[PDB]
Design a protein around this ligand. Structure first.
Ligand SMILES: Nc1ncnc2c1ncn2[C@@H]1O[C@H](CSCC[C@H](N)C(=O)O)[C@@H](O)[C@H]1O
Ligand SMILES: Nc1ncnc2c1ncn2[C@@H]1O[C@H](CSCC[C@H](N)C(=O)O)[C@@H](O)[C@H]1O
Ligand SMILES: [Zn+2]
Ligand SMILES: [Zn+2]
Ligand SMILES: [Zn+2]
Ligand SMILES: [Zn+2]
Lengths: 851, 851
């Protein structure tokens, strides 16, 4: 009576080493450790998982198979992957890791990831020599493989007997090295009757091991699940080899965790009615899940729902067939790797959104207060706030979602909007909810963006953050002007040009930020003020949110709430981000100039005379040293003390990304190397003698994004018109890139000339979409780059594309160009063949073939 | 009438490129930038000079040629070398740098070196377009060379005319590109009559440029000094090529400078009498120099003196001739590069000693207080403090300076000692002074170390910091036991082993440290207490110091004073350092364990119940996790939270070396890689089967130090007995190093067998000097490593050196062994030849030649 597991073991040991290497990863899920391993190689202590074990445990935790809580004990913690992961979980209060260490054994790696202060990893600790301790969660990942099943068998029994006394009425997750040996099966069955639980297989396990995990939250037949794994693994012997499914690795954050500072206290007076209506609308599946993971967001309930998302995006075929040598390159195809599944959403939420910012110091709040009041006055020197209207909102919708064009057309939609507006006037809010992913819910949602648009839309529609009105702003300028603005800034004497990224800007917006942004209502007419005051107080400073969550029993929709942070899916996000960033960068300039000291930040009663004088005499000039677009900023300070000015910036919550909190910033003096709005900008001399300033970025980012379809049902003609749109865009904005202009030419010749580009190449505020036309590209290029280009005085047109410059050939290569490679040369010769292939797929329309 | 400068220029332009490269550095002084350039390459912002310009300016500043003060303006600041250097000078309050920048021009580099907060470097600033500003110091280093002298001429005149209006009654240092053209000479002469000053040549200038500097503090004949430079440079054309004189680069420290927190306020009641006596003793040259450089030490006066020191140490010839292939290696000969000249002393003082530590927080002082009181009680549990005596002090002197053996023999010395002791009993101090480098001054000095020895010598003499008495200490253990103690520590379960170096420990000793170390007097007998109280209060907490300083008019001896810091040239330095370090590492362990929080450090009234309980229940066990020898420490905490525990350590002033202040520490789990007392320790298996634990270090450090003579008058027989001493030491402690045992064999065969080793191989407290004997080395080796080695149970002797193990051959190589190189092989064959050479120099004594 030989078991299937033993059959598998017999086949595995007979494998040559090469077939073994191919088999062990065939069709498995594998996390991408490339970034983390290089981070650890440089001694980084934040964000990185210390091993592949963090992701492995995460797979269990995601599915509520084990929910770490209270005192967590991690037997055989090794480098500490499981321990560091548990440190950030809601109900975990202490993590104790024991591991052997010494020669041939992994050692604990010290880290500063989130919750490090409740992690206690001890080496020199053989767990088979340890008396069991009281704990609320028991973890164990011990088990050393052997070519002999019976050797593994005794190792597995040893583990099980060691670990059994640690368990009683607590959570656990225990590795079972060899689960298919009859004596192990028999032992596990008796264990299951005392402590409950079930055996589960982790998809991240390699096929070279039959390992399964005894977890506490589940029931089921041990014998059955084991043989299901055995068959799965035997099947994968003969099954045609398939590459592993690559997932993104975990981000464990940074800093000390204070469990009691995490929970949210909601304003139930304000958000209560909204919950009640969601509850009424979904009463048939409404429930309260105590096992919700939310630490810093208040939880209010859930209802059941059909799942939504995809493990990776759709591919545009027309452009992928015209860019054959980019199938091979990593970062291109590793941009289609996207997860909007309920699992990926929860991962992003935990790692990025489920955080809390400490309140800024009293002196810091004073400075922000003074600066905000000054900034709003400056911004409203010429303009006044105004209400937007139904007709306005309707026009904008029509000129671009098709369900939205139907909704604004329905009078019943506007009756709902009116009803909710009357609530707002009374200080009440009934259906104002946003999401993180009947038609009554669709109407409730679109109706809410309208009421926001009505109250705060003036910031966008009336260009409050144009350069002329805000000095620092770049709204309405366009990607083809941004480079020129940075070049102009570089001419101002002083320090280097700095461009520090904030780590998750929207989550870093504080209660004090929100109350400073609110001050613009003091410039409003009374009836406008009451509507805006409703938006700020009821929906901005008290957000009610829908988010999907995977459960053992299907997907659910959680209703949660938060007082601070920025609702990212909202009208006014860009303008308010730009305003707060302007303010923040002014404050940092004050610090670098010595106007604002450490003593001032801590001083509970800061004197305002000093700040007011600096603003009234230097404020505007310092605004002109900056280019600010939402969370993205470029600052050129009067000197480089700015680099070391980190006190105010951190205390305001605007912690920089990918750099230690107190390490000085590093800038540029060549403006052409400064990153801004996902681009850098090159100065090019036309052979006509004149000069252009062009936007540029890593080419693979441009290639890969173009290879992504829109619409969950590509209809060839639709997906080709999108390919033409990227081609037109490339010829208008990235004409200087040799590979792109050649591929732009190829797409436009492989697509019918009369077909109009559809969909959107991008949703960037800086994109004016001049490329979505039937008009000749050289005539469009002339209009953009010569005619209405204010930094081009000689208005002489260009008659030939050969007077339109490329980048320097080394610079082209440096930014990702494949020019030089053999494959690129081959690809170039093969172009009219690939043209014919696309044209054959489309069919029989009018083509004009292009160089 | 062609000038000599023009003659030089004519010869320089006719040089081929290779002869040009040889000439331009022939016999010049050149700073070593290797460390700094790699530091900057990794983006380090502390300590490093940003260019070779910092050292260049330093040469001028050293000699009072220009003394930067008040507002300093740096024209053509470039990367900012001059500006960052000035930022740390006593009377400088603000540094403004202007430089052009842009293509082809140097750009300002942001740094966090000491005084960065008063440095304002602006780029995009052409100084020939700038209106002159008011300043107290004008710096300018502009001047672009040309093969044409007349091109340079107009460039130099342009500079001089630009810079002249910046000057009036202020300090300046101005580069004169081409000083030898007649029109420049004529212009400089008229400039000198209005603004004074003189032309000076910087030795760090290359021979490829005739550049000189117009400095404000000096007079002299311009024509003369210029032609003296011209002749010097012509001479260097034909002069046989000489390698540049390599100096150590500058260290500009780190952190913000607060000018008003720097000055020292002396206790004149206490130190007044001491100054008065130095003043009386040296009245004929006593003066008060207002141009003294001291920022954080109080200055009291100066007297004139003959210079003392040497630009590099003496070389031992016997061992250098037996180690021929190490003439070539850098770090060996770059260990003889030593500067005890008055110039080097001042550099070390400014960079390392002339600093100030901020007062620790009130909560931090409470913890240190509690821990110190507990530590002293533990240390005195078995022993009592006791007075040491004349007879004791005399015995110690005799058993090792020859002037000291004469002094303790003279009854008149002890009459002076008695006289001073009676002052101490009354709370007065008359002649208690130490130094930084008649016989009445020699007697005053030796008499002072006695009174210290008398009061605090018990700490050393009675082994208060032996491991048995202090748990953490290693006093009296020896370098051959240290490795075994670290191995024993590694067996204690918990975190990694940490060994963080403090940056200049002795300068980091605070007023609170001194007052905690003082508490041991509470365990003394009354008559002992009054003597010790005198030492602590009068000479430890109020130090009067002699230090040499170079001036335009010769060397002087400055009298300065300081309240805190540790007098490094003092009895009890090691014991008090060990005590304070033990205390500090206990405090850091409390923080890592969460017993001590940020709130506690800041809490002005910390509750002691928590600290006292941790000490009384865990104190000793935590002491046993450590090995502490003075400022050097090894800690193995209960887990690795210790790595991130930096709050208390920094606030106590014990800032770590070569690592950002708030970056987590990184440790070891292999105890054999842990650095301790300038060594690491390897475990070796004898072929007898038993194991040894041996001390090891980079071999070039052992080679180079052995190649250094003692005594400023090597008498061959004296310097050879020193070579034998290093040979004996190597065979006892570094027998495992293949190159060293072979070179040990060679020295002992090239030196007469009956000659006894003299002088000292080292002054380390861990050196028991068992190697200074005539006795057979294998018998000495047996006694040390088998007989009285407590970690060697099998006491079976070793009869042959071939049962004495070497390191693993890869490990030998890794630690600097030249085994494998061709030169090492050649060196090995050439040994009996080199033996014969040494023996030929010595003469005709009895040799025994050795393998
Ligand atoms: N007897 C024993 N006592 C304690 N630890 C042991 C042990 N036998 C093996 N181990 C350790 O258990 C570890 C299993 S690998 C565990 C990795 C960990 N879960 C992570 O995510 O990082 C190995 O590093 C091994 O050193
Ligand atoms: N016209 C001008 N205006 C301002 N700076 C100029 C200038 N012409 C040259 N310079 C700058 O002057 C510098 C001289 S090298 C100065 C180095 C500096 N003393 C240090 O220690 O680091 C060059 O970097 C050059 O860029
Ligand atoms: Zn509402
Ligand atoms: Zn580019
Ligand atoms: Zn005295
Ligand atoms: Zn070694």
């Amino acid at each position: 009576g030989e078991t299937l597991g033993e059959k598998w073991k017999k086949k595995l040991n007979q494998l040559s080493r090469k077939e073994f290497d191919l088999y062990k990863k065939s069709g498995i899920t594998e996390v991408d450790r490339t970034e983390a391993k290089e981070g650890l190689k440089r001694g980084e202590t934040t964000h990185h998982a210390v091993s592949r074990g963090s992701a492995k445990l995460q797979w269990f935790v995601e599915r509520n198979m084990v929910i770490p809580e209270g005192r967590v004990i991690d037997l055989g913690c090794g480098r500490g992957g499981w321990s560091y992961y548990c440190a950030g979980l809601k109900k975990v209060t202490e993590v104790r890791g024991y591991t052997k260490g010494g020669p041939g054994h992994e050692e604990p790696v010290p880290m500063s990831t989130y919750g490090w202060n409740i992690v206690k990893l001890m080496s020199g600790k053989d767990v088979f020599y340890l008396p069991p301790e009281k704990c609320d969660t028991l973890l164990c990942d011990i088990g050393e493989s052997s070519p002999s099943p019976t050797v593994e068998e005794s190792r597995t029994i040893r583990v099980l007997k060691m670990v059994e006394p640690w368990l009683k009425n607590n959570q656990f997750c225990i590795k079972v090295l060899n689960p298919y040996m009859p004596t192990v099966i028999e032992h596990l069955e008796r264990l299951q009757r005392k402590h409950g639980g079930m055996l589960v297989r982790n998809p991240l396990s390699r096929n070279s091991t039959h390992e399964m995990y005894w977890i506490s939250n589940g029931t089921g037949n041990i014998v059955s699940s084991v043989n299901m794994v055995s068959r799965l693994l035997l099947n994968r012997f003969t099954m045609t080899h398939r590459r592993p499914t690559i997932e993104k690795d975990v981000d464990l954050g940074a800093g000390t965790r204070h469990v009691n500072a995490e929970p949210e206290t909601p304003n139930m007076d304000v958000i209560g009615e909204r919950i009640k209506r969601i509850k009424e609308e979904h009463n048939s599946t409404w429930h309260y899940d105590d096992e919700n993971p939310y630490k810093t967001w208040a939880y209010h309930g859930s209802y059941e729902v059909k799942a939504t998302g995809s493990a990776s995006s759709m591919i545009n075929g027309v452009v992928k067939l015209l860019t054959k040598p980019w199938d091979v390159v990593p970062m291109v195809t590793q941009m289609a790797m996207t997860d909007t599944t309920p699992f990926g959403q929860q991962r992003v939420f935990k790692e990025k959104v489920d955080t809390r910012t400490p309140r800024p110091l009293p002196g810091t709040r004073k400075v922000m207060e003074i600066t905000a009041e000054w900034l709003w006055r400056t911004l409203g020197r010429n303009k006044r706030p105004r209400l937007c209207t139904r007709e306005e909102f309707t026009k904008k919708v029509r000129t671009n979602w098709d369900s939205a064009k139907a909704a604004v057309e329905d009078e019943e939609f506007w009756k709902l909007v009116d009803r909710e507006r009357e609530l707002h006037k009374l200080g009440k809010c009934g259906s104002c909810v946003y999401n993180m992913m009947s038609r009554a819910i669709w109407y409730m949602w679109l109706g809410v963006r309208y009421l926001e648009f009505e109250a705060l839309g003036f910031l966008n529609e009336d260009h409050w953050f144009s350069r002329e009105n805000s000095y620092s702003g770049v709204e309405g300028e366009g990607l083809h002007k941004l480079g020129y603005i940075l070049r102009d800034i570089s001419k101002i004497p002083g320090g280097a040009m700095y461009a520090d990224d904030t780590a998750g800007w929207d989550t870093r917006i504080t209660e004090d930020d929100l109350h400073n942004e609110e001050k613009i209502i003091q410039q409003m007419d009374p009836e406008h003020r009451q509507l805006a005051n409703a938006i700020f107080k009821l929906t901005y400073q008290n957000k009610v949110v829908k988010v999907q969550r995977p459960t053992p029993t299907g997907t659910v929709m959680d209703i949660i709430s938060r007082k601070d942070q920025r609702g990212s899916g909202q009208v006014g996000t860009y303008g308010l981000n730009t305003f707060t960033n302007m303010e923040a960068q002014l404050v940092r300039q004050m610090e670098g100039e010595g106007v604002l000291t450490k003593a001032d930040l801590e001083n509970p009663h800061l004197l305002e005379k000093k700040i007011t004088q600096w603003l009234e005499t230097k404020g505007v000039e310092r605004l002109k040293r900056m280019a600010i677009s939402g969370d993205d900023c470029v600052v050129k300070p009067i000197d480089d003390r700015f680099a070391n000015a980190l006190l105010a910036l951190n205390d305001m919550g605007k912690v920089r990304k990918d750099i230690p909190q107190w390490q000085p910033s590093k800038g540029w003096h060549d403006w052409q190397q400064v990153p801004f709005c996902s681009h850098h900008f090159h100065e090019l001399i036309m052979k006509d003698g004149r000069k252009l300033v062009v936007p540029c970025r890593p080419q693979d980012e441009l290639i890969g994004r173009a290879r992504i379809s829109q619409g969950a049902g590509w209809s060839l003609r639709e997906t080709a018109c999108l390919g033409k749109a990227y081609a037109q865009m490339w010829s208008l904005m990235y004409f200087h890139r040799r590979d792109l202009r050649l591929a732009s030419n190829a797409i436009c010749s492989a697509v019918p000339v009369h077909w109009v580009p559809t969909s959107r190449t991008t949703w960037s505020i800086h994109a004016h979409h001049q490329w979505m036309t039937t008009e000749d590209m050289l005539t469009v290029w002339n209009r953009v780059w010569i005619e209405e280009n204010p930094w081009m005085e000689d208005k002489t047109p260009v008659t030939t594309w050969e007077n339109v410059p490329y980048l320097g050939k080394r610079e082209d290569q440096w930014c990702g160009s494949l020019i030089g490679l053999t494959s690129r040369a081959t690809w170039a010769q093969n172009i009219p063949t690939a043209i014919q292939q696309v044209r054959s797929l489309i069919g029989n329309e009018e083509f004009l073939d292009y160089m």
